[PDB]
Coordinates of C-alpha atoms and ligand atoms in Angstrom, one line a residue:
Chain A
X1 CA 0.2 0.1 0.0
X2 CA 1.2 3.0 -1.2
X3 CA 2.3 5.7 1.7
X4 CA 0.9 8.8 2.3
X5 CA 3.7 10.6 4.7
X6 CA 6.4 8.9 6.6
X7 CA 7.8 8.5 10.2
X8 CA 11.4 8.1 10.9
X9 CA 12.6 7.9 14.6
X10 CA 14.6 6.0 17.2
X11 CA 18.9 6.8 16.8
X12 CA 21.2 9.7 16.6
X13 CA 20.7 9.8 12.9
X14 CA 24.7 10.5 12.5
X15 CA 24.9 9.2 8.8
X16 CA 21.6 10.8 8.1
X17 CA 20.1 7.1 8.3
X18 CA 16.8 8.6 9.4
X19 CA 15.5 11.7 7.4
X20 CA 13.5 10.8 4.8
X21 CA 13.6 12.7 1.7
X22 CA 11.1 14.2 -0.1
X23 CA 11.0 12.7 -2.7
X24 CA 10.6 9.0 -0.2
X25 CA 7.6 11.3 2.1
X26 CA 5.0 10.1 -0.2
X27 CA 3.9 7.0 -2.8
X28 CA 6.4 4.4 -1.4
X29 CA 5.2 0.7 -0.6
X30 CA 8.2 -0.4 1.3
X31 CA 11.1 0.9 3.2
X32 CA 15.0 -0.8 3.8
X33 CA 16.5 0.7 6.8
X34 CA 20.9 0.2 6.6
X35 CA 23.3 1.1 8.6
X36 CA 24.2 4.1 7.2
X37 CA 21.7 4.8 4.7
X38 CA 18.3 3.9 4.3
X39 CA 16.4 2.0 0.6
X40 CA 13.1 3.0 -1.2
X41 CA 10.6 1.3 -3.6
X42 CA 8.4 4.0 -5.3
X43 CA 6.3 2.9 -8.1
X44 CA 9.4 -0.1 -8.6
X45 CA 12.3 2.3 -8.4
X46 CA 15.1 2.2 -5.5
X47 CA 15.1 5.7 -4.0
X48 CA 17.6 6.1 -1.1
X49 CA 19.2 8.2 1.6
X50 CA 22.0 8.7 4.1
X51 CA 26.3 8.3 3.4
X52 CA 27.7 6.6 0.5
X53 CA 30.6 5.2 1.6
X54 CA 31.0 2.1 0.2
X55 CA 28.4 2.8 -2.7
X56 CA 25.5 1.6 -1.6
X57 CA 23.2 3.8 -2.9
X58 CA 25.0 4.6 -6.2
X59 CA 21.9 2.6 -7.4
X60 CA 22.1 0.4 -10.4
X61 CA 20.9 1.0 -13.5
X62 CA 18.6 -2.0 -13.5
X63 CA 16.7 -0.3 -9.9
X64 CA 15.0 2.1 -12.0
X65 CA 12.3 0.1 -12.7
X66 CA 10.7 -2.7 -11.8
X67 CA 11.6 -3.5 -8.9
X68 CA 9.7 -5.4 -6.4
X69 CA 11.6 -5.9 -3.0
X70 CA 14.4 -4.3 -1.2
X71 CA 16.9 -4.9 2.1
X72 CA 19.8 -3.0 3.4
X73 CA 22.3 -4.2 5.0
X74 CA 25.3 -2.5 6.5
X75 CA 27.8 -1.3 3.9
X76 CA 25.1 -3.0 0.7
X77 CA 21.8 -3.1 -0.8
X78 CA 19.8 -5.5 -2.4
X79 CA 16.8 -5.2 -5.0
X80 CA 14.4 -8.5 -5.6
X81 CA 13.5 -7.8 -9.3
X82 CA 11.2 -10.0 -11.5
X83 CA 12.9 -13.0 -9.7
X84 CA 16.4 -11.8 -10.1
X85 CA 18.4 -10.8 -6.9
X86 CA 20.2 -7.9 -7.4
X87 CA 22.8 -6.3 -5.3
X88 CA 25.9 -3.2 -4.3
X89 CA 27.3 -1.2 -2.2
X90 CA 30.3 -2.7 0.0
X91 CA 31.3 -6.5 -0.4
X92 CA 34.6 -7.4 1.3
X93 CA 33.1 -10.4 2.5
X94 CA 31.4 -10.9 -0.8
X95 CA 28.2 -10.1 -0.1
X96 CA 27.1 -8.6 -3.4
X97 CA 28.4 -11.0 -5.5
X98 CA 25.2 -12.8 -6.3
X99 CA 25.3 -16.5 -7.1
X100 CA 23.6 -18.2 -10.4
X101 CA 20.6 -20.0 -8.4
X102 CA 19.8 -15.9 -6.9
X103 CA 19.5 -14.6 -10.4
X104 CA 15.6 -15.9 -11.5
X105 CA 12.9 -17.3 -8.9
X106 CA 13.3 -15.7 -6.0
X107 CA 10.4 -14.6 -4.3
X108 CA 12.1 -13.2 -1.3
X109 CA 15.1 -11.8 0.2
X110 CA 16.7 -10.1 3.4
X111 CA 20.1 -8.4 4.5
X112 CA 21.8 -9.1 7.0
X113 CA 24.4 -6.4 8.7
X114 CA 27.4 -8.8 5.9
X115 CA 25.6 -10.9 3.9
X116 CA 22.5 -11.5 1.8
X117 CA 19.5 -13.9 1.7
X118 CA 17.5 -15.3 -1.7
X119 CA 14.3 -17.4 -1.2
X120 CA 13.8 -20.1 -3.7
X121 CA 11.2 -22.5 -4.3
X122 CA 11.0 -22.8 -0.5
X123 CA 15.1 -23.3 -0.3
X124 CA 17.3 -20.0 1.4
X125 CA 20.4 -19.2 -0.6
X126 CA 22.8 -17.4 1.4
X127 CA 26.1 -15.7 0.4
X128 CA 28.4 -13.6 1.9
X129 CA 30.3 -13.2 6.2
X130 CA 30.0 -16.6 7.3
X131 CA 32.4 -15.4 9.8
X132 CA 29.9 -16.6 12.5
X133 CA 28.0 -19.1 11.1
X134 CA 25.9 -16.7 9.5
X135 CA 25.6 -18.2 6.2
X136 CA 25.9 -22.1 6.1
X137 CA 22.2 -22.7 5.5
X138 CA 21.0 -25.2 7.6
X139 CA 19.5 -28.7 6.1
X140 CA 16.2 -28.1 7.5
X141 CA 16.0 -24.2 5.4
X142 CA 16.7 -25.8 2.4
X143 CA 13.3 -26.8 1.5
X144 CA 9.6 -26.0 2.3
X145 CA 10.1 -22.3 4.2
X146 CA 8.2 -19.7 3.7
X147 CA 10.0 -16.9 5.4
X148 CA 13.2 -14.9 5.8
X149 CA 15.2 -12.5 7.7
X150 CA 18.8 -12.0 8.4
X151 CA 20.4 -10.8 11.8
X152 CA 23.7 -9.0 12.3
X153 CA 25.2 -12.5 13.4
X154 CA 22.3 -14.7 12.7
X155 CA 19.5 -15.8 10.4
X156 CA 16.0 -17.1 10.8
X157 CA 13.2 -18.7 8.7
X158 CA 10.1 -20.2 9.1
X159 CA 8.9 -23.5 8.0
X160 CA 6.1 -25.1 8.0
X161 CA 5.0 -22.3 11.4
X162 CA 8.1 -23.4 12.9
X163 CA 11.2 -21.5 13.3
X164 CA 14.5 -22.3 12.0
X165 CA 17.4 -20.6 13.2
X166 CA 21.5 -20.4 13.1
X167 CA 24.9 -18.3 12.6
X168 CA 25.6 -16.8 16.8
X169 CA 24.0 -17.8 19.7
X170 CA 25.7 -16.6 22.4
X171 CA 22.7 -14.9 24.1
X172 CA 20.6 -18.2 23.5
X173 CA 19.3 -15.8 20.2
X174 CA 19.6 -18.8 18.1
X175 CA 18.0 -21.2 20.6
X176 CA 13.9 -21.9 19.1
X177 CA 11.2 -21.6 22.0
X178 CA 9.0 -24.5 22.1
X179 CA 6.0 -22.3 21.4
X180 CA 7.6 -21.5 17.9
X181 CA 8.0 -24.9 16.5
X182 CA 4.3 -24.7 14.7
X183 CA 1.9 -21.1 13.7
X184 CA 4.3 -18.8 13.7
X185 CA 3.9 -16.5 10.0
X186 CA 7.2 -14.4 10.3
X187 CA 10.8 -13.5 12.5
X188 CA 12.8 -11.0 12.5
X189 CA 16.6 -11.1 13.6
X190 CA 18.0 -8.3 16.4
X191 CA 21.9 -8.1 17.5
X192 CA 21.0 -10.8 20.1
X193 CA 17.0 -11.5 20.3
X194 CA 14.8 -12.9 17.9
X195 CA 11.8 -12.6 17.2
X196 CA 8.5 -14.7 16.1
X197 CA 5.1 -13.5 15.4
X198 CA 1.9 -16.1 16.1
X199 CA -0.8 -15.8 15.1
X200 CA -0.6 -12.6 16.5
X201 CA 1.9 -12.6 18.9
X202 CA 4.9 -11.8 19.4
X203 CA 7.0 -14.3 21.3
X204 CA 10.7 -12.9 21.8
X205 CA 14.2 -14.9 23.3
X206 CA 17.8 -14.2 23.6
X207 CA 19.3 -11.6 25.7
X208 CA 17.0 -9.3 27.9
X209 CA 20.0 -7.2 29.8
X210 CA 18.2 -4.2 27.7
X211 CA 14.9 -5.7 27.3
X212 CA 14.6 -7.1 23.6
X213 CA 12.7 -10.0 25.3
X214 CA 10.1 -7.8 27.4
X215 CA 7.4 -8.1 24.9
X216 CA 4.5 -5.6 26.4
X217 CA 1.4 -7.3 27.1
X218 CA -0.2 -5.5 24.1
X219 CA 1.9 -7.3 21.9
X220 CA 0.6 -10.4 22.8
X221 CA -2.1 -10.3 20.8
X222 CA -3.8 -8.8 17.5
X223 CA 0.0 -7.9 16.0
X224 CA -0.2 -7.7 12.5
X225 CA 4.1 -7.1 11.8
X226 CA 7.0 -7.2 13.8
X227 CA 10.5 -6.1 13.2
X228 CA 13.7 -5.5 14.6
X229 CA 16.5 -3.4 15.1
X230 CA 20.1 -4.4 16.9
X231 CA 18.7 -3.3 19.8
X232 CA 15.3 -2.9 20.1
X233 CA 12.1 -3.9 18.7
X234 CA 8.4 -3.3 16.8
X235 CA 5.5 -4.4 16.6
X236 CA 1.9 -3.0 14.5
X237 CA -1.2 -3.6 15.7
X238 CA -4.2 -1.9 14.2
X239 CA -2.1 0.7 12.8
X240 CA -0.6 1.7 16.4
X241 CA 3.4 1.0 16.3
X242 CA 4.5 -0.9 19.5
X243 CA 8.0 -0.6 20.6
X244 CA 10.2 -1.9 23.5
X245 CA 14.2 -2.5 24.2
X246 CA 17.0 -0.1 25.1
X247 CA 14.7 2.4 26.5
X248 CA 13.2 2.6 22.6
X249 CA 9.1 3.6 22.8
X250 CA 6.7 4.8 19.7
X251 CA 5.7 8.5 19.7
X252 CA 2.2 9.5 19.5
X253 CA 3.0 10.0 15.3
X254 CA 3.1 6.3 15.0
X255 CA 0.2 5.7 17.5
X256 CA -2.3 5.4 14.5
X257 CA -2.6 5.2 10.6
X258 CA 0.4 3.5 9.9
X259 CA 0.1 0.2 7.7
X260 CA 3.1 -1.1 7.5
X261 CA 6.7 -0.6 9.2
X262 CA 10.6 -1.6 9.4
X263 CA 13.6 -1.6 11.4
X264 CA 17.2 -0.2 10.3
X265 CA 19.9 -1.1 12.9
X266 CA 19.1 2.5 14.5
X267 CA 16.7 3.5 13.2
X268 CA 12.5 2.9 13.0
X269 CA 10.5 3.6 10.3
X270 CA 6.7 3.8 9.6
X271 CA 4.7 3.7 7.1
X272 CA 1.8 5.6 7.3
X273 CA -1.1 4.6 4.8
Chain B
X1 CA 29.4 39.7 17.4
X2 CA 26.8 38.4 14.3
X3 CA 27.5 34.7 15.8
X4 CA 26.7 35.6 19.2
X5 CA 23.4 36.9 17.7
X6 CA 23.1 33.3 16.4
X7 CA 24.0 31.7 18.9
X8 CA 20.9 33.1 20.8
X9 CA 18.8 32.6 18.0
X10 CA 19.9 28.6 18.2
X11 CA 18.2 29.5 21.7
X12 CA 15.1 30.8 20.9
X13 CA 15.0 28.1 17.9
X14 CA 15.1 25.2 19.6
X15 CA 13.6 25.7 23.3
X16 CA 16.8 25.1 24.6
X17 CA 20.1 25.8 26.6
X18 CA 23.0 26.4 23.5
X19 CA 27.0 27.1 25.2
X20 CA 29.5 28.7 22.8
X21 CA 33.2 28.8 23.2
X22 CA 35.3 29.7 19.7
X23 CA 39.0 30.0 21.1
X24 CA 42.0 31.4 19.2
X25 CA 44.3 28.3 18.7
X26 CA 47.3 30.1 18.8
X27 CA 47.3 32.3 21.8
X28 CA 44.6 30.8 23.0
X29 CA 42.2 33.4 23.3
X30 CA 39.4 33.8 24.3
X31 CA 37.0 35.2 20.5
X32 CA 33.6 35.2 21.7
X33 CA 31.6 32.9 24.1
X34 CA 28.2 32.2 25.5
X35 CA 27.4 30.6 28.6
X36 CA 31.0 29.3 28.5
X37 CA 30.8 27.6 32.0
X38 CA 27.8 26.1 32.5
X39 CA 27.9 22.7 31.8
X40 CA 26.8 20.2 29.5
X41 CA 27.3 16.6 28.8
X42 CA 29.8 16.4 26.2
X43 CA 28.5 12.5 24.8
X44 CA 31.1 11.3 22.6
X45 CA 33.1 14.2 22.9
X46 CA 34.4 12.4 25.2
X47 CA 36.2 10.2 23.1
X48 CA 38.9 12.2 22.1
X49 CA 39.8 13.5 25.3
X50 CA 40.0 9.5 25.8
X51 CA 42.4 8.4 23.2
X52 CA 44.7 12.0 24.4
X53 CA 45.3 9.6 27.5
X54 CA 45.4 7.0 25.1
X55 CA 48.0 8.6 23.1
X56 CA 50.0 10.0 26.3
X57 CA 50.4 6.5 27.8
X58 CA 51.9 5.9 23.9
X59 CA 54.5 8.5 24.5
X60 CA 55.4 7.3 28.1
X61 CA 55.8 3.1 26.3
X62 CA 52.7 2.1 28.5
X63 CA 50.7 1.8 25.4
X64 CA 51.3 0.4 21.8
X65 CA 49.2 1.6 18.7
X66 CA 49.2 -1.5 17.3
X67 CA 48.5 -3.5 20.1
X68 CA 45.6 -6.2 19.7
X69 CA 42.4 -6.8 21.8
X70 CA 40.1 -9.5 21.2
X71 CA 36.8 -8.7 22.6
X72 CA 33.3 -11.0 23.4
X73 CA 29.8 -10.9 22.7
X74 CA 29.6 -9.5 25.8
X75 CA 31.3 -6.2 25.2
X76 CA 29.3 -4.9 22.6
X77 CA 27.1 -2.0 23.6
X78 CA 24.2 -0.4 21.0
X79 CA 26.1 2.2 18.0
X80 CA 28.6 -0.1 17.4
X81 CA 29.3 -0.2 13.3
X82 CA 33.2 -1.0 14.1
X83 CA 33.6 -3.3 16.7
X84 CA 30.8 -5.2 15.9
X85 CA 32.0 -6.5 12.5
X86 CA 35.3 -7.4 14.3
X87 CA 34.8 -10.0 17.2
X88 CA 36.8 -12.9 15.8
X89 CA 40.0 -10.6 14.2
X90 CA 40.1 -8.3 17.6
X91 CA 41.4 -4.2 16.7
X92 CA 44.2 -2.5 17.5
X93 CA 43.9 0.4 19.6
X94 CA 44.8 2.5 16.9
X95 CA 41.7 0.8 14.8
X96 CA 39.9 1.3 18.1
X97 CA 40.8 5.1 18.8
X98 CA 40.4 5.9 14.9
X99 CA 36.3 4.0 15.3
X100 CA 35.0 6.3 18.8
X101 CA 36.5 9.5 16.8
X102 CA 35.0 8.8 13.6
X103 CA 32.4 6.7 13.7
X104 CA 31.7 7.6 17.7
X105 CA 31.6 3.2 18.2
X106 CA 30.3 3.5 21.8
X107 CA 32.4 -0.7 21.9
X108 CA 35.5 1.1 20.6
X109 CA 35.1 3.9 23.5
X110 CA 34.4 1.0 26.3
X111 CA 37.2 -1.2 25.3
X112 CA 40.1 1.7 25.6
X113 CA 38.1 3.3 28.7
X114 CA 39.4 -0.1 30.3
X115 CA 43.2 0.3 28.4
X116 CA 43.3 3.3 31.3
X117 CA 41.3 1.4 34.0
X118 CA 38.0 3.3 33.6
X119 CA 36.0 6.9 33.2
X120 CA 37.8 7.5 37.1
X121 CA 41.2 7.3 35.5
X122 CA 40.1 9.6 32.0
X123 CA 39.0 12.1 34.7
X124 CA 42.1 11.8 36.4
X125 CA 44.1 12.4 33.5
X126 CA 42.2 15.4 33.2
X127 CA 42.8 16.6 36.5
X128 CA 47.0 16.1 36.2
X129 CA 46.8 17.9 32.6
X130 CA 44.6 21.1 35.1
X131 CA 41.4 20.5 33.7
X132 CA 38.9 20.3 37.5
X133 CA 35.5 20.8 35.2
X134 CA 35.8 17.7 32.8
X135 CA 34.6 14.7 34.4
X136 CA 33.7 11.4 32.9
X137 CA 31.6 8.9 35.3
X138 CA 30.2 6.3 33.5
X139 CA 30.7 3.8 30.6
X140 CA 28.8 3.7 27.2
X141 CA 26.1 3.9 26.8
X142 CA 24.5 5.5 30.6
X143 CA 26.7 9.0 29.8
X144 CA 24.8 10.2 27.3
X145 CA 21.9 10.3 29.2
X146 CA 22.0 13.8 29.8
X147 CA 19.3 13.7 32.9
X148 CA 18.5 17.6 33.6
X149 CA 20.8 19.8 36.5
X150 CA 23.2 15.9 36.6
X151 CA 26.6 17.2 36.6
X152 CA 27.8 13.0 35.5
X153 CA 29.7 13.2 32.4
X154 CA 30.0 16.6 31.4
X155 CA 32.0 19.8 30.8
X156 CA 31.8 23.4 30.5
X157 CA 32.7 25.5 26.9
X158 CA 35.7 27.1 28.1
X159 CA 37.0 23.8 30.0
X160 CA 36.5 21.6 26.8
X161 CA 38.3 24.3 24.5
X162 CA 40.9 24.7 27.0
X163 CA 41.5 20.6 27.2
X164 CA 41.0 20.4 23.5
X165 CA 43.6 23.5 22.8
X166 CA 46.2 21.9 25.4
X167 CA 46.0 18.4 23.4
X168 CA 46.4 20.0 19.9
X169 CA 48.7 22.5 20.7
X170 CA 50.9 21.9 23.5
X171 CA 53.3 19.9 24.9
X172 CA 51.7 17.4 26.4
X173 CA 51.6 15.2 23.4
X174 CA 54.5 14.4 21.4
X175 CA 54.8 16.2 17.8
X176 CA 53.4 12.0 16.2
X177 CA 51.0 11.7 18.8
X178 CA 49.2 15.6 17.8
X179 CA 49.3 15.2 14.6
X180 CA 47.5 11.5 14.6
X181 CA 44.9 12.9 17.4
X182 CA 43.8 16.0 15.1
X183 CA 44.3 12.8 11.8
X184 CA 41.3 11.4 13.4
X185 CA 39.1 14.2 13.9
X186 CA 39.8 15.0 10.5
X187 CA 38.7 11.9 9.2
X188 CA 35.4 12.5 11.3
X189 CA 32.4 11.1 9.4
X190 CA 29.5 11.8 11.8
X191 CA 29.5 15.8 11.4
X192 CA 28.4 16.4 8.0
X193 CA 25.3 18.1 8.4
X194 CA 27.1 20.3 11.4
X195 CA 29.6 22.8 11.1
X196 CA 31.0 21.1 7.8
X197 CA 28.1 21.7 6.2
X198 CA 28.9 25.9 6.1
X199 CA 32.5 25.2 4.9
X200 CA 33.4 26.7 1.7
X201 CA 36.1 24.6 -0.5
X202 CA 40.0 24.4 1.1
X203 CA 39.3 25.0 4.9
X204 CA 40.4 22.7 6.9
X205 CA 38.7 21.6 9.9
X206 CA 39.2 18.4 12.3
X207 CA 36.6 17.9 14.8
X208 CA 34.7 15.6 17.2
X209 CA 30.4 15.2 17.4
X210 CA 28.0 14.2 20.2
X211 CA 24.4 13.4 20.0
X212 CA 22.3 12.0 23.1
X213 CA 19.3 11.6 25.1
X214 CA 16.7 14.7 25.7
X215 CA 17.6 17.0 23.3
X216 CA 21.2 16.9 23.9
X217 CA 23.9 17.6 21.0
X218 CA 27.3 18.7 20.9
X219 CA 30.8 19.2 18.7
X220 CA 34.4 20.3 19.3
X221 CA 36.3 21.1 16.6
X222 CA 39.4 22.8 15.0
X223 CA 38.7 24.3 11.7
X224 CA 40.8 27.4 9.6
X225 CA 41.0 28.3 6.1
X226 CA 44.0 27.3 3.5
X227 CA 44.0 24.3 4.9
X228 CA 44.7 24.9 7.7
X229 CA 43.6 24.9 11.4
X230 CA 43.5 28.4 13.9
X231 CA 40.7 27.9 16.1
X232 CA 39.2 26.1 18.3
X233 CA 35.2 25.8 18.6
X234 CA 32.9 24.6 21.1
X235 CA 29.0 24.3 21.1
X236 CA 26.7 21.9 23.3
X237 CA 22.9 22.4 23.2
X238 CA 20.6 20.3 26.0
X239 CA 16.7 20.4 26.5
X240 CA 15.7 20.9 22.9
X241 CA 12.3 18.9 22.1
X242 CA 13.9 19.4 18.1
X243 CA 14.7 16.8 15.9
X244 CA 18.3 15.8 15.0
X245 CA 18.0 17.9 11.3
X246 CA 16.6 20.7 13.4
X247 CA 19.1 20.1 15.9
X248 CA 21.9 20.2 13.4
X249 CA 20.5 23.3 11.2
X250 CA 21.2 25.2 13.8
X251 CA 24.5 24.6 14.4
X252 CA 24.9 24.7 11.3
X253 CA 23.8 28.4 11.1
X254 CA 26.4 29.2 13.7
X255 CA 28.8 27.2 11.6
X256 CA 27.9 30.0 8.2
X257 CA 28.4 32.9 11.0
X258 CA 31.2 31.9 12.0
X259 CA 32.3 31.6 8.4
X260 CA 31.0 34.3 6.8
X261 CA 32.3 36.7 9.3
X262 CA 35.6 35.1 9.5
Ligands
CA301 CA1 8.1 -5.7 -11.2
CA302 CA1 31.1 -16.2 2.2
CA303 CA1 6.3 -16.4 1.9
CA304 CA1 16.3 -8.4 9.5
CA305 CA1 17.9 32.5 25.7

């Protein structure tokens, strides 16, 4: 749904990643938050703002039109165009070198801090940094997957309503709770915590020193969407955004009328429809 | 005195307190000021003092810029873009300072704080340097809390500016260390919408910005035309309800005033 306005908040906006320029303030149906930049999808065209030290904002010609989805990591950007995954920006860890199988048939993408993921025919394909095992896909996630997401040192997937998680597990962010073995509809990975949306209920596990897994009561039912930054989380319920972790809260501007949310490492974004 | 006008107008626009001090790098003479002796949270601007202390140790041979430090998941706190990428390979003291100063990496600052013994030790460093005002009490990210009237983790514009001048030109650090400190500040990556945005071509600026809670925002800088620094400028603000962009803009405009009447 095309937004009529966009609200961004959280973090220090040190790189200008939380300032959505006028051109992306309306008509955009998607936003992807990177560490130093932001991307937006407008009429199939990829827009961007923020820092471009690694060329993550030097849009490839092919993204000027027909793009269906976008994602952003620490130094790179991803776009999905007619089943093909397009990548650009920093490539120190091979995160922008798209493998052959991800050049067609892909129906979803997600970016990790230094990694890229494609979902095609129920199979998760990953590339880029693997120093924490975040890009070594478990056998289970290689078939029947319906949703995926990338974290900083991790990645998550939904298969037959059950969560599959891999990468760093220092704080238990990859130990899937019994409750998330079925009925799960979406996942979101934080730096040391993880989220699952199960029939309107937000389930969280992993680190809690900064309250990341202390789910507000209101987010225990009727939630239609979730998103995770590094140290904070978001839930969308009846057009109202709910935030928790690291003292993050939701300003009054996103208390109503929000049709979709996006969480960058630090900056949160709400698309008002 | 047109910069003074703009500074006071910044308080009008932001509905908050603004502290300002402009020093002549050479004579160390105060050229202009506003609320020079009131306290403000340093936020990340303290990282330049922290690395000053680190370099002092390198100079005395108690530390090595190339010494590699390995840390764990347990050391990471928010706003640590560089350190979060080096859990496996670690980072050298030099790299930690570059990250703390040029990217405001919180974890890097915490790691460096540990190499000197903690926040009390940085405060000890400041005292023995002649700065009995500037104080660091907590670690990242807590030190950015900026609760009103709280003096923890604060400095005064005149104190910070004086201390900055002593570090960049005094005999406190060797010539090599003074140059490395100013090099890190010149390589600052998170201050473009501040003084740098009002800077015309050919000007030199070495700075360190800071952002915190409850509207706290700030910057310390050594700048000058013709690729050479000739003045120290310190600006702090706290208490505003305005967006970060609106606050950046006011600081930028103060910068424009400084430049237009330089
Ligand atoms: Ca298309
Ligand atoms: Ca690889
Ligand atoms: Ca799907
Ligand atoms: Ca994610
Ligand atoms: Ca006033």
